[PDB]
Design a protein around this motif. Structure first.
Motif, PDB file in Angstrom:
ATOM      1  N   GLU F 139       0.833  -1.194   0.000  1.00 14.87           N
ATOM      2  CA  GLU F 139       0.000   0.000   0.000  1.00 14.87           C
ATOM      3  C   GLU F 139       0.876   1.256   0.000  1.00 14.87           C
ATOM      4  O   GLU F 139       0.649   2.149  -0.825  1.00 14.87           O
ATOM      5  CB  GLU F 139      -0.984  -0.016   1.171  1.00 14.87           C
ATOM      6  N   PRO F 140       1.883   1.382   0.879  1.00 13.80           N
ATOM      7  CA  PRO F 140       2.877   2.447   0.665  1.00 13.80           C
ATOM      8  C   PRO F 140       3.555   2.364  -0.683  1.00 13.80           C
ATOM      9  O   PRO F 140       3.863   3.407  -1.270  1.00 13.80           O
ATOM     10  CB  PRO F 140       3.868   2.240   1.814  1.00 13.80           C
ATOM     11  N   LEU F 141       3.818   1.156  -1.191  1.00  9.02           N
ATOM     12  CA  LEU F 141       4.103   1.039  -2.614  1.00  9.02           C
ATOM     13  C   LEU F 141       2.976   1.664  -3.413  1.00  9.02           C
ATOM     14  O   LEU F 141       3.184   2.690  -4.064  1.00  9.02           O
ATOM     15  CB  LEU F 141       4.325  -0.421  -3.017  1.00  9.02           C
ATOM     16  N   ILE F 142       1.761   1.118  -3.300  1.00  8.20           N
ATOM     17  CA  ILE F 142       0.606   1.711  -3.968  1.00  8.20           C
ATOM     18  C   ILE F 142       0.570   3.214  -3.760  1.00  8.20           C
ATOM     19  O   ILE F 142       0.337   3.959  -4.714  1.00  8.20           O
ATOM     20  CB  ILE F 142      -0.704   1.051  -3.488  1.00  8.20           C
ATOM     21  N   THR F 148       4.235   7.655  -8.445  1.00  7.70           N
ATOM     22  CA  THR F 148       5.213   7.424  -9.501  1.00  7.70           C
ATOM     23  C   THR F 148       4.523   7.258 -10.850  1.00  7.70           C
ATOM     24  O   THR F 148       4.963   7.825 -11.857  1.00  7.70           O
ATOM     25  CB  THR F 148       6.069   6.201  -9.179  1.00  7.70           C
ATOM     26  N   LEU F 149       3.436   6.486 -10.886  1.00 11.89           N
ATOM     27  CA  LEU F 149       2.617   6.422 -12.092  1.00 11.89           C
ATOM     28  C   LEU F 149       1.520   7.472 -12.058  1.00 11.89           C
ATOM     29  O   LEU F 149       0.696   7.555 -12.976  1.00 11.89           O
ATOM     30  CB  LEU F 149       2.012   5.032 -12.247  1.00 11.89           C
ATOM     31  N   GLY F 150       1.471   8.253 -10.989  1.00 12.08           N
ATOM     32  CA  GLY F 150       0.594   9.396 -10.923  1.00 12.08           C
ATOM     33  C   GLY F 150       1.384  10.659 -11.171  1.00 12.08           C
ATOM     34  O   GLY F 150       0.981  11.742 -10.740  1.00 12.08           O
ATOM     35  N   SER F 156      -2.563   8.956 -14.057  1.00 11.00           N
ATOM     36  CA  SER F 156      -3.633   8.010 -13.767  1.00 11.00           C
ATOM     37  C   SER F 156      -3.245   6.950 -12.744  1.00 11.00           C
ATOM     38  O   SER F 156      -4.129   6.452 -12.033  1.00 11.00           O
ATOM     39  CB  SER F 156      -4.067   7.287 -15.048  1.00 11.00           C
ATOM     40  N   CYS F 157      -1.965   6.593 -12.649  1.00 11.04           N
ATOM     41  CA  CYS F 157      -1.542   5.416 -11.904  1.00 11.04           C
ATOM     42  C   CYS F 157      -2.290   4.177 -12.360  1.00 11.04           C
ATOM     43  O   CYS F 157      -3.224   3.728 -11.689  1.00 11.04           O
ATOM     44  CB  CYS F 157      -1.724   5.578 -10.398  1.00 11.04           C
ATOM     45  N   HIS F 158      -1.945   3.658 -13.532  1.00 15.08           N
ATOM     46  CA  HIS F 158      -2.360   2.296 -13.808  1.00 15.08           C
ATOM     47  C   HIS F 158      -1.785   1.435 -12.698  1.00 15.08           C
ATOM     48  O   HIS F 158      -0.579   1.469 -12.445  1.00 15.08           O
ATOM     49  CB  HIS F 158      -1.873   1.829 -15.179  1.00 15.08           C
ATOM     50  N   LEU F 378       9.309   4.556 -13.994  1.00 14.46           N
ATOM     51  CA  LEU F 378       9.282   3.408 -13.095  1.00 14.46           C
ATOM     52  C   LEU F 378      10.466   3.391 -12.141  1.00 14.46           C
ATOM     53  O   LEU F 378      10.281   3.236 -10.927  1.00 14.46           O
ATOM     54  CB  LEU F 378       9.229   2.127 -13.921  1.00 14.46           C
ATOM     55  N   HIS F 379      11.681   3.592 -12.664  1.00 13.90           N
ATOM     56  CA  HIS F 379      12.898   3.318 -11.899  1.00 13.90           C
ATOM     57  C   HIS F 379      12.818   3.921 -10.508  1.00 13.90           C
ATOM     58  O   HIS F 379      13.311   3.339  -9.536  1.00 13.90           O
ATOM     59  CB  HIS F 379      14.107   3.893 -12.628  1.00 13.90           C
ATOM     60  N   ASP F 380      12.176   5.080 -10.401  1.00 14.99           N
ATOM     61  CA  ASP F 380      12.010   5.742  -9.117  1.00 14.99           C
ATOM     62  C   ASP F 380      11.345   4.820  -8.104  1.00 14.99           C
ATOM     63  O   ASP F 380      11.982   4.398  -7.130  1.00 14.99           O
ATOM     64  CB  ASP F 380      11.193   7.010  -9.329  1.00 14.99           C
ATOM     65  N   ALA F 381      10.073   4.480  -8.330  1.00 15.33           N
ATOM     66  CA  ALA F 381       9.383   3.548  -7.444  1.00 15.33           C
ATOM     67  C   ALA F 381      10.104   2.209  -7.388  1.00 15.33           C
ATOM     68  O   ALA F 381      10.058   1.509  -6.371  1.00 15.33           O
ATOM     69  CB  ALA F 381       7.940   3.360  -7.902  1.00 15.33           C
TER      70      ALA F 381
END
Lengths: 102, 285, 73, 512, 510, 517
Positions: F139-142, F148-150, F156-158, F378-381
């Motif tokens: 969830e902290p990932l989420i 990161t995808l937001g 949108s954060c797919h 991506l690489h960030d997350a």
């Protein structure tokens, strides 16, 4: 080195018989004169290749319009082979010499 | 080459190609509004509104202009032969134009089918010059006067001439310089020198085999190449021929005398061949 | 490389996109007043368009929006 | 074809001498600036010492080049002391420049210098403190402190004594050099700061992880060490060769062959001796198979220094030819083990037949911390080895400098005249070193140095500034410890270039 | 001139000013360069390399001026340096100093000949009274002290303190092998400078010292027939074809082996001619080396011409590139021809000992070239001052205790001989004070202070200036006996010499 | 030789310290504004972080030069915080200027910065939670897999890549002993589908060589047979002449293919799979004729790829066809041709549960521009969880932590004092700039923002609150779900403090005449 005169040979080769044709060129214009003044008096054979063949007059005539294609074709083609070989010959001269000296 | 100046050549150049005439006036009409248009611009009038006001009012003016006008008879050759002459009389060039008004108007009257006399395109007209002769020897000819003529054994003048055209290469294919031979030695080429021989003749034979009385031949530069030993045999087939003609004049020839573009023996039948009642070159005068 | 912050970018972002945005609205709609297309580096050749997609190509632009908005166009 | 003469030229010589001297000034203490040096290189060059940029530096005053040479001299001679020799000349040159107008110009110049630098080397040797093996210490306990000294210099953990006694060891092992090279530290990015290993043989930070490297032994107790200076790759015999096809075995043949010559050359030194195959240069993905297809370990893309370390420690001879086959261009460790240390795929070579190269493993993977310790270790090494090499030692932070200055200007009083004006200014030469440090140590070069003069007129044992402690005290019992020879040698070069170049206002040049 | 013609840059004022002034320019440092000299001179020679000395001639030759004024007198200074090793540091200063009295006498308005001729007869008077002031003579070359005593004076006249270990080391080079009777040689005794060891490790190996790596074995014989060759190896491998090594894959095979057998024949022909040492200014090759190891002919890997030159000079060798079988013409000379490590540098050593012709080869071990070459400089000009070729040098006060005697001698007498010449004769006794000043220069006091006291020492020959403070406050150091005298001759020339050009360079208004 | 004054240089230092620090300050976060790169080629490019734009931007001053050097490390380990250190550098540094402009040593206060680092680091060591776990972190990932995808490619954060990216990590996370590398996981950019088309692969996906589909497309087993050599008659991915003597001999030619299909099929199969990557590309004919005969082989392959699949399998390649081995073939727990893109052939999916040291997320994108920006995203997350798997510790920061860590250090200044007091004072204000400097990039008064939480920090310290980086009406950290691995911020703390120290390095301000020349 070997690459020098490989090209200049076939240069000099097709050079001369081409020039032989220039004599034959006058003749190929004169053979248009000689046969056209032959009405079938003297038996006209083409001399075209090694078989010497009983021939007719149009066969004699159309041939020498086609025999001029000797002077036409062989002369022209070589002016390619002249520089076709000449440049690759000239190219290879300084390259391999400077090496073997250097 | 200032853009405004760039337009003004076509100002006349249209009038050059429009009426062929009055091309000074169309420049002399230019700056007159160009003054007035800046005025409106200086008046602040919007160049659209300026524009918008004009071809509008141009339609008006031409009527009143046409209201001034007197129609003449376009169906009558002589009326125009009187009128355009009077116009020629209204112009500088007379001397020949006098002589050439009938020649013009007749050549025109010959390209005048309509009583309207349509636009009388100079299209259908071929203006040819011949170095000899005199202006008296300027003459209207009802089949195309063609540049020169070229025949080796080809018939000097063939009547009822089927007019061929060569859009195909008479030269044997070029595998080395121009020749069907490749350049290496003397021996291998002479057998494919035999090949250059027959091919150029056969296509030439094929020419007269679908047949033509005359053959339009463009330039050999207007060709890839055209083998003369073929042509040497082609006129030896006793075909009247011309060589080295404009492919553009060909396009004139194609349309006016109906000898259509021919790249093929097949395109020889009588089909794309104009049938020319008398084909002859005149060296005279 | 030239770091161009908001101060430099905006003015540069406007000057093309605005004044080129002029050129497209300059020729706009039926009354849209044509632009003489300046053929630049090639002749003068004068071209006259109600279409800005023409204007996009003719004179090359370094203005980034004007560069980008060629695609937007 | 040039020349020059006179005080107008003479001061000009001195003029440049003062300029550069401010570069070596605090370069010891890492507080200041530094100038990244781009050259026609176009690349970053950043120093801990002027000597680095001195090598870079090109002079319009070749007089400045003179001091360079002698500043380079004791520097390269000791591994340090540019800062010493540099400031020493420029000092008096600064000092004498006002005298120059009066003139020291009579060549009475050096007669001061000689005697000046003379009294001290005597005064220094009596203030030089000799040490031995079990004498006051274990001789490890000596270097324990001497390494503790420079490890206590700039702040790290109790790793100081942890690093100290350890690094003392390979020192006690290979000490011949004053240099740390044969002991040179391996930075390891990874592990713990509590993880550090002084290794008695050459230890390779990295070799690359190949295809078959996983199948290559990470363990040899008899490494036969091929030191390869070239690449052995898929392109040795290139793997793309076109083939005529009337059938499909023509492809099979042309492919299965050009692959072999790869294996062929490399297996020659393999079959000869080579279990440990060390290339400083890339290994192709196909050739490392042939390396592993034998299962004799190959290492390509390995440190040249380690590669050269190996030739030192492991008795190996560096090989530029795999086509050169022999066991003495190999080398024999009795330890090849490879355990990835942190992230680095990491080769252990010890059991060298002599092992004249050691290396200290430093881990914890803290770039800031460790490199500073590494600079700290250099000075520890710089001390401890030279603390051996000269067992007569002496206290830093100008511990004798105010004393010398006193001791020297003590002799001033009797002369007075041109050379006393030196002997005082010659005494004044000493405070410049703590002076700059007063900037770094957070002190008053005005107030403090006199206190140390006072504490050499009150004390006078070692009393002097500690940039470390940010205080002032006896530096020997503030434990700031360096040999006196470098200071003796500092003296020798001190007046030398000083008295030297001041003898030239008359300068000749001939670019023509 | 006024007219577009008349090529010249010298004349009139610019003569009575600039010429003499340009002459003044260079003698300026010669003052700091003679007698005890604490002064030093950076010089870059068109290597951009700094070098330091007190000597003018090393520097002046480099220096380039519009005016022959400087360009001429050096020849006389050379003419000294040619005949006498030192004093040339002095030989310039006196003339330039004595000159500028004229331009003063020219402001005082004394004629060219008038100013000239007074110096002349006084110079003769000097040359008359100058030998009267001969205070000693040298004695024995075999004696180190008798030689070294003097030798300091010139080393002094270059550099002060070093002279002590040096002057001894010089006669220890055996200046004594030659009689110094009608003969002496530098190249035989030649300085050979080993960078490394100490500067006081500078040694003496009688017989050649060649710092060049001594290769092969030791010479086949010590008498060695010595064929020295400029480049007997140009390579016997040829540099040709594609890679500047090979072109065709077949090329490399003949390149590698051809060097061997050629060099084999070459080094065999070294034995075939009988050369017992091979000297290659050309490259060394291990095969040829092993051939020189087989044929046991000592090898020299590389040569300065100085090597070849001296080998050509001394051995009677002739250095020639041999791609050619060596032929002894060079032959032998030196009866003992060695390998040695001196400074523990491989030292090519040839030695033969003869009263004349013996190489007794100064070998300078030294810590610094830039020093050891200037250390060479003083010993050079010291042993060249040893070169008088009078074993008894009719010594006069060295470091110039003379001038005070003569400065007293002439101008006193200078007035006695009357007429305006007398003033030129009296100006003649003035520029003597130069070195008393030039030392008081580098000593740091006034020549007046000097001369006033050193006139107050009156007839002495002993007390005079020097270095330290005893040239300062008393201006009194014993320049007869500090151990320091100088030959009358080197002194005798400087007066004679600096008489000529000085007189000369004034005469010329074009 | 031109030596300048360190002061003058310190100017050129601080003169460089601004725009780069500035670059982020309206670019910080999504409330920050995009960073445009136009090239030496004149190529318009929208950029991100520091290191993207910093390397693209051509560094001039030593600082600018030193920037990218320092700056890489934060994106290496953490993946984020790269934008911050550059802000943080100048912020403190440009006051350190002002402090030195007070006549303050760089010497004396920079220690205090190094020293106030730790006490802020330790104050940081208080902040938020010390723990994340496999299901927890998701969830902290989420949270970050949101932002990161937001952020870059879409806001949108797919949850696709959001939970695909973590899984590759989570797959290789435990593998490395709570570690991962981004070779060890991999972003596979290949288009043919949009951003919404992505994948996670346990191995390599390659688009499977087929010279004809009707000649059977066959994938099977779990295993690939890894070959530098042929599974069907070879060829060095170049032109080859195929001739036969007579009319009939063309038929015998295919037999040779047909036999050496099975001859290689039967050779390479027994050693595992039938699927053999063949680095050799072949003519159309034998390829499909083997696809026909049986068991497709992959031809026209990157030498790296036959190597990539091998090192992915942890076994070798079979270099020689005369040779063969199972280890030299593939270790793969799955090999399947799977339809690749919407636009092109089926990819051959090698997902290795036999041996995989690398587990690779694959991404399609509707453009390269977006698939790269997601690849850029991506690489960030990816890296933050790399921190997590080693140390699962995160810190609520970006307006919670700065002013927090600054406040204690503000207080530490007065506890400590002298050189550290104006160090720790100035040390602190730089931190408080970043959340301030977000309202800079955002629409809000940067002052009153910093003021705001400054009140809240007086209220509550290390709050689950913070500023609004998303510019939400609520100013939070927890419910902003803004947060960083306490690795990262501390690591981010290190760098500017490192660099503002590195400008102090030793002494030498002299050059040969060449420093930037």
């Amino acid at each position: 080195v070997e690459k020098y005169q490989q090209l200049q040979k076939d240069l000099s080769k097709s050079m001369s018989g081409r020039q032989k044709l220039e004599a034959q060129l006058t003749e190929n214009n004169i053979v248009k004169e000689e046969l056209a003044l032959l009405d079938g008096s003297n038996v006209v054979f083409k001399l075209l290749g090694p078989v010497l063949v009983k021939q007719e007059l149009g066969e004699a005539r159309a041939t020498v319009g086609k025999r001029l294609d000797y002077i036409t074709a062989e002369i022209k083609r070589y002016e390619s082979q002249l520089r076709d070989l000449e440049r690759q010959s000239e190219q290879q001269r300084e390259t391999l010499a400077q090496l073997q000296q250097e | 080459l200032h853009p405004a100046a760039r337009m003004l050549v076509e100002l006349s150049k249209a009038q050059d190609i429009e009426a062929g005439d009055g091309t000074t006036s169309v420049v002399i009409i230019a700056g007159s509004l160009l003054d007035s248009c800046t005025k409106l611009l200086q008046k602040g009038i919007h160049p659209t509104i300026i524009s918008e006001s004009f071809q509008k009012a141009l339609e008006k003016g031409i009527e009143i202009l046409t209201d001034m006008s007197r129609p003449v008879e376009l169906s009558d050759r002589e009326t125009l032969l009187n009128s355009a002459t009077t116009s020629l009389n209204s112009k500088v060039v007379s001397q020949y134009s006098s002589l050439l008004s009938p020649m013009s108007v007749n050549a025109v009257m010959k390209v005048i089918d309509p009583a309207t006399a349509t636009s009388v395109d100079l299209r259908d007209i071929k203006i040819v010059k011949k170095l000899g002769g005199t202006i008296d020897d300027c003459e209207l000819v009802e089949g195309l006067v063609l540049t020169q003529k070229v025949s080796n054994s080809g018939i000097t003048r063939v009547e009822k001439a089927k007019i061929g055209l060569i859009q195909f290469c008479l030269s044997a294919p070029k595998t080395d310089m121009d020749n069907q031979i490749v350049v290496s030695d003397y021996a291998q080429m002479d057998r494919v020198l035999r090949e250059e021989r027959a091919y150029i003749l056969n296509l030439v034979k094929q020419i007269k085999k679908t047949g033509c009385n005359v053959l339009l031949i463009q330039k050999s530069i207007l060709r890839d190449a055209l083998s003369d030993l073929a042509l040497h045999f082609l006129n030896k087939m006793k075909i009247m021929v011309i060589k080295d003609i404009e492919r553009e004049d060909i396009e004139f020839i194609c349309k006016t005398i109906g000898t259509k573009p021919v790249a093929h023996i097949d395109q020889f039948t009588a089909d794309m061949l104009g049938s020319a009642e008398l084909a002859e070159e005149v060296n005279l005068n | 490389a030239d770091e161009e912050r908001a101060e430099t970018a905006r003015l540069t972002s406007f000057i093309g996109a605005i004044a080129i945005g002029d050129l497209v609205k300059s020729t706009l709609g039926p009354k849209g007043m044509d632009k003489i297309l300046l053929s630049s580096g090639r002749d003068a050749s004068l071209m006259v368009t109600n279409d800005g997609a023409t204007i996009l190509k003719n004179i090359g632009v370094d203005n980034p929006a004007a560069k980008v908005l060629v695609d937007m166009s | 074809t040039d020349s020059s003469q006179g005080i107008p030229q003479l001061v000009s010589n001195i003029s440049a001498c003062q300029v550069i001297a401010e570069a070596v000034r605090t370069t010891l203490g890492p507080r200041g600036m530094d100038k990244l040096i781009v050259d026609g290189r176009g690349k970053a060059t950043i120093s801990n010492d002027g000597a680095t940029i001195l090598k870079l530096l090109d002079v319009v005053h070749p007089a400045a080049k003179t001091l360079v040479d002698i500043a380079k001299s004791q520097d390269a001679e000791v591994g340090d002391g540019t800062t010493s020799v540099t400031l020493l000349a420029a000092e008096f040159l600064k000092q004498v420049k006002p005298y120059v107008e009066e003139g020291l110009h009579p060549q009475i110049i050096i007669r001061a210098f000689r005697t000046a630098t003379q009294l001290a080397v005597n005064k220094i040797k009596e203030i030089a403190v000799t040490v031995k093996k079990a004498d006051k210490v274990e001789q490890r306990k000596l270097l324990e402190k001497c390494a503790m000294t420079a490890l206590s210099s700039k702040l790290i953990s109790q790793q100081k004594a942890f690093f100290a006694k350890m690094v003392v060891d390979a020192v006690m092992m290979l000490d011949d050099l004053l240099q740390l090279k044969m002991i040179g530290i391996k930075k390891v990015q990874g592990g713990a700061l509590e993880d550090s290993q002084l290794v008695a043989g050459v230890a390779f930070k990295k070799t690359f992880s190949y295809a078959g490297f996983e199948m290559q032994p990470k363990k040899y107790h008899n490494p036969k060490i091929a030191l390869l200076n070239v690449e052995l790759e898929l392109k040795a015999e290139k793997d793309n060769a076109e083939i005529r096809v009337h059938t499909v075995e023509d492809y099979q043949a042309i492919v299965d062959a050009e692959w072999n010559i790869l294996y062929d050359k490399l297996e020659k030194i393999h079959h000869s001796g080579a279990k440990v195959v060390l290339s400083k240069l890339p290994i192709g993905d196909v050739a490392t198979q042939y390396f592993a297809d034998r299962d004799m370990f190959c290492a390509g893309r390995v440190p040249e220094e380690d590669l050269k370390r190996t030739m030192m420690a492991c008795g190996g001879s560096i090989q530029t030819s795999v086509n050169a086959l022999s066991a003495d261009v190999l080398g024999r460790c009795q330890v090849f083990e490879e355990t990835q240390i942190g992230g680095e795929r990491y080769n252990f070579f010890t059991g060298c037949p002599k092992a004249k190269t050691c290396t200290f493993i430093l881990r914890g993977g803290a770039e800031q911390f460790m490199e500073e310790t590494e600079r700290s270790l250099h000075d520890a090494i710089m001390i401890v080895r030279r603390a051996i090499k000269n067992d007569s030692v002496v206290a830093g932070g100008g511990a004798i400098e105010m004393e010398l200055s006193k001791y020297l200007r003590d002799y001033s009083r009797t002369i007075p005249g041109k050379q006393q004006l030196l002997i005082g200014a010659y005494a004044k030469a000493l405070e410049i070193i703590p002076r700059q440090l007063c900037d770094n140590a957070g002190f008053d070069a005005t107030n403090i140095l006199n206190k140390l003069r006072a504490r050499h007129a009150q004390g006078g044992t070692w009393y002097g500034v500690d940039i470390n402690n940010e205080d002032i005290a006896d530096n020997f019992e503030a434990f700031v410890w360096e040999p006196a020879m470098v200071r003796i040698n500092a003296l020798t070069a001190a007046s030398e270039a000083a008295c030297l170049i001041v003898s030239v206002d008359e300068t000749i040049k001939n670019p023509r | 001139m006024l007219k577009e013609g008349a090529k010249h840059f010298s004349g009139l004022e610019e003569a009575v000013y600039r010429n003499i002034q340009a002459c003044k320019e260079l003698a300026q440092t010669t003052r700091t360069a003679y007698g005890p000299n604490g002064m030093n001179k950076m010089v870059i020679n068109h290597l951009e390399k700094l070098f330091v000395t007190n000597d003018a001639a090393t520097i002046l030759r480099e220096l380039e001026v519009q005016h022959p004024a400087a360009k001429m007198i050096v020849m006389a200074s050379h003419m000294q340096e040619q005949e006498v090793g030192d004093g040339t540091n002095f030989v310039l200063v006196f003339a330039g100093a004595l000159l500028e009295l004229a331009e003063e006498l020219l402001r005082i308005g004394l004629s060219v000949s008038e100013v000239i001729e007074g110096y002349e007869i006084a110079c003769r008077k000097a040359h008359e009274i100058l030998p009267n002031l001969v205070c000693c003579s040298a004695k024995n070359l075999r004696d180190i002290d008798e030689v070294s005593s003097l030798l300091r004076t010139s080393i002094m006249s270059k550099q002060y303190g070093n002279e002590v270990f040096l002057a001894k080391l010089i006669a220890q080079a055996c200046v004594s092998i030659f009689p110094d009777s009608g003969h002496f040689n530098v190249d035989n005794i030649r300085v050979c400078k080993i960078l490394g060891s100490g500067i006081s490790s500078s040694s003496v190996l009688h017989g050649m010292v060649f710092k060049k790596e001594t290769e092969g074995d030791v010479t086949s014989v010590k008498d060695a027939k010595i064929a020295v060759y400029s480049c007997p190896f140009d390579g016997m491998i040829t540099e040709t074809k594609g890679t500047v090594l090979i072109k065709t894959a077949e090329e490399l095979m003949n390149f590698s082996k051809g060097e061997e057998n050629l060099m084999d024949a070459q080094v065999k022909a070294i034995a075939d001619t009988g050369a017992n040492v091979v000297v290659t200014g050309g490259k060394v090759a291990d095969m040829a080396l092993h051939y020189a190891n087989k044929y046991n002919i000592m090898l020299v890997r590389l040569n300065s011409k100085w090597d070849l030159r001296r080998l050509c000079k001394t051995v009677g060798a002739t250095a020639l590139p041999r791609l050619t079988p060596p032929v002894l013409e060079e032959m032998g000379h030196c009866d003992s021809v060695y390998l040695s490590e001196v400074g523990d540098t491989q030292v090519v050593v040839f030695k033969h000992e003869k009263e004349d012709g013996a190489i007794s080869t100064i070998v300078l071990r030294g810590s610094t070239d830039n020093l050891m070459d200037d250390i060479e400089r003083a010993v050079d000009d010291g042993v060249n001052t040893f070169k008088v070729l009078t074993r008894d040098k009719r010594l006069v006060p060295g470091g110039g205790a003379t001038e005070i005697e003569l400065a007293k001698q002439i101008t006193s007498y200078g007035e006695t001989c009357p007429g305006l010449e007398q003033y030129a004769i009296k100006k003649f006794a003035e520029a003597f004070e130069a070195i008393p000043r030039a030392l008081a220069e580098n000593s740091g006091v006034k020549a007046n202070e000097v001369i006033s006291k050193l006139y107050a020492v009156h007839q002495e020959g002993n007390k005079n200036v020097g270095l330290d403070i005893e040239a300062e406050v008393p201006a009194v150091k014993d320049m007869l006996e500090a151990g320091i005298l100088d030959t009358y001759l080197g002194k005798y020339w400087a007066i004679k010499l600096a008489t000529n050009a000085a007189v000369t360079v004034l005469r010329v208004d074009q | 030789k031109s030596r300048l004054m360190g002061l003058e240089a310190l100017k050129s230092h601080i003169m460089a310290a601004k725009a780069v620090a500035n670059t982020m300050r309206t670019s910080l976060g999504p409330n920050g504004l995009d960073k445009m790169m136009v090239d030496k080629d004149g190529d318009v490019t929208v950029t991100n972080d520091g290191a993207t734009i910093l390397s693209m931007m051509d560094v001039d001053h030593q600082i600018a030069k030193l920037m990218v050097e320092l700056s890489k490390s934060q994106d290496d380990e953490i993946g984020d915080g790269t934008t911050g250190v550059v802000v943080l550098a100048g912020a403190l540094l440009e006051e350190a200027e002002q402090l030195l402009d007070r006549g303050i040593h760089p010497i004396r206060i920079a220690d205090g910065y190094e020293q106030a680092a730790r006490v802020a680091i330790e104050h940081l060591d208080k902040i938020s939670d010390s723990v994340l776990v496999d299901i927890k972190d998701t969830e902290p990932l989420i949270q970050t897999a949101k932002t990161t995808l937001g952020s870059k490619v879409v806001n949108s954060c797919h949850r696709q890549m959001a939970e695909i990216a973590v899984n590759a990590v989570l797959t290789v996370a435990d593998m490395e002993r709570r570690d991962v590398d981004f070779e060890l996981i991999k972003v596979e950019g290949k288009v043919g589908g949009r951003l919404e088309d992505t994948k996670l692969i346990k191995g390599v996906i390659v688009d499977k060589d087929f010279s004809h589909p009707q000649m059977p497309k066959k994938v099977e087993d779990a295993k690939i047979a890894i070959l530098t050599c042929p599974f069907e008659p070879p060829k060095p991915k170049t032109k080859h002449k195929l001739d036969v003597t007579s009319v009939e001999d063309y038929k015998a030619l295919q037999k040779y293919e047909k036999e050496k299909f099975e001859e290689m099929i039967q050779q390479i199969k027994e050693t595992g799979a039938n699927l053999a990557i063949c680095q050799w590309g072949f003519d159309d004919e034998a390829n499909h004729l083997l696809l026909q005969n049986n068991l497709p082989a992959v031809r026209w392959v990157g030498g790296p790829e036959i190597e990539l699949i091998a090192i992915a399998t942890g076994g070798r390649i079979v270099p020689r066809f005369s040779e063969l081995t199972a280890e030299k073939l593939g270790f793969a727990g799955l090999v399947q041709e799977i339809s690749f893109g919407t636009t092109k052939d089926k990819m051959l999916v090698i997902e290795q549960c036999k041996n995989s040291r690398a587990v690779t997320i694959f991404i399609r994108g509707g453009n390269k521009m977006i698939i790269e920006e997601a690849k850029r995203s991506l690489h960030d997350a990816l890296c933050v969880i790399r921190n997590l798997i080693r140390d699962n510790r995160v810190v609520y920061g970006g307006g919670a932590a700065e002013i927090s860590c600054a406040l204690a250090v503000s207080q530490e200044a007065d506890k400590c004092p002298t050189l550290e007091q104006y160090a720790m004072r100035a040390f602190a204000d730089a931190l408080e700039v970043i959340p301030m400097a977000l309202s800079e990039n955002s629409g809000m008064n940067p002052i009153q923002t910093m003021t705001e939480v400054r009140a809240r920090q007086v209220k509550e310290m290390n709050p689950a609150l913070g500023i609004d980086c998303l510019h939400k009406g609520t100013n939070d950290m927890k419910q902003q779900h803004v947060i960083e691995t306490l690795i990262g911020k501390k690591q981010q703390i290190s760098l500017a403090t490192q660099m503002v120290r590195m400008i102090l390095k030793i002494d030498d301000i002299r050059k040969p005449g060449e420093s930037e020349e």
